[PDB]
């Protein structure tokens, strides 16, 4: 009747310091549709952030891609935050260069 999310955080292209890239946070497997997702830079939420349109899989669970243009620096540390009716606390998954 309710499904927890699964979250994956990564870059569109391989991450090299100073070269522009896209931070993607992909949430899938969850239900109902309402979910709060934010991308985080050094802890502060990023305000320029766009999301895909709502679709679901064969098991009817939903998936959204939240993305933003960014530029890695080896100084800035990035992560993803989700809150859902399934989730007791919001969930933080930090980005790893080698996903």
């Amino acid at each position: 009747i309710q499904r927890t999310p699964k979250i994956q955080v990564y870059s569109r292209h391989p991450a090299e310091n100073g070269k522009s890239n896209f931070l993607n946070c992909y949430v899938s497997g969850f239900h109902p549709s309402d979910i709060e997702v934010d991308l985080l830079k050094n802890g502060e939420r990023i305000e320029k952030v766009e999301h895909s349109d709502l679709s679901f899989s064969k098991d009817w669970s939903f998936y959204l891609l939240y993305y933003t243009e960014f530029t890695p620096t080896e100084k800035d540390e990035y992560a993803c935050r989700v809150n859902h009716v399934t989730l007791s606390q919001p969930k933080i998954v930090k980005w790893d260069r080698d996903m």
Binding site: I1, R3, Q8, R12, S33, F56, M99
Partner: protein, 275 residues
């Protein structure tokens, strides 16, 4: 290669606000090409792919009208279904509808489907013959009766064998530079030591389309399932997809493991080993 077209419809009931939300997306194969949101200001079906932008007023006009009709049908049936389940009028409830049609390289109709869900569980389905329904609950039995006595499968099979395939053939011609292309996986393998005697080998596929791909880890040439980790094929936002698989291996034995990659854009399966 065969090509599909599938449409996805979510309606969730908003008791506090009072008028439910309706989101509809359209995919050709793995490439979404339209969309419709009920709280967005536009109140029309919106292109989400370049090759559908060419279609003119009448196409967008007819699509918006039909999708709004679907929105209202969903609202009413949300009301009916809260009764069929003796459910609280306070709570919020979801109706999902997926339907579509599959054509092959000959262009000929291959199959059709239409499934409906309530609250993330199967509610009713069109069977593989497009003239029988399979309900999943007693409330669904109520729906089948009304549907069977209204011969709805006829309308669903007229559409699935009719407009659905004709139009998917039109779209597959309109976007043939992008819908019938096969961007092969770009593969590479990383090495991250975990202990003085354990290391992880991770196998990377990036930039591939369509999203179907098969990554396999084989130890001494026999498929390895224990100590594996494979992640869900994810989108990149450039219209390609990504995937990786990984294995924890002892030290000194990194060359006794092999990553095998199968995808359409590879005509013969690829093999990768840590050099």
């Amino acid at each position: 290669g065969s090509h599909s077209m599938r449409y996805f419809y979510t309606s969730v009931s908003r008791p506090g606000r009072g008028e439910p939300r309706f989101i509809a997306v359209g995919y050709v194969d793995d490439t979404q090409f339209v969309r419709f949101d009920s709280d967005a200001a536009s109140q029309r079906m919106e292109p989400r792919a370049p090759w559908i932008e060419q279609e003119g007023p009448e196409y967008w006009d007819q699509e918006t009208r039909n999708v709004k009709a679907q929105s209202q049908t969903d609202r009413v049936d949300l009301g009916t279904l809260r009764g069929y389940y003796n459910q609280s009028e306070d709570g919020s409830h979801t109706i999902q509808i997926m339907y579509g049609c599959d054509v092959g390289p000959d262009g000929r109709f291959l199959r059709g489907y239409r499934q409906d869900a309530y609250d993330g569980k199967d509610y009713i389905a069109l069977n593989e013959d497009l003239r029988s329904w399979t309900a999943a609950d007693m409330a669904a039995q109520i729906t089948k009766r009304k549907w069977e006595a209204a011969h709805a499968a006829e309308q669903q099979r007229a559409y699935l064998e009719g407009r659905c395939v004709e139009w998917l053939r039109r779209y597959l011609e309109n976007g043939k530079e992008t819908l019938q292309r096969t961007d092969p996986p770009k593969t590479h393998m990383t090495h991250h030591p975990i202990s003085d005697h354990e290391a992880t080998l991770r196998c990377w596929a990036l930039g591939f389309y369509p999203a179907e791909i098969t990554l396999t880890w084989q130890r001494d040439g026999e498929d390895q399932t224990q100590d594996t980790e494979l992640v869900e094929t994810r989108p990149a936002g450039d219209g390609t997809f990504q995937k990786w698989a990984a294995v924890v291996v002892p030290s000194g034995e990194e060359q006794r493991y092999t990553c095998h990659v199968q995808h359409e854009g590879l005509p013969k399966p690829l093999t990768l080993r840590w050099e």
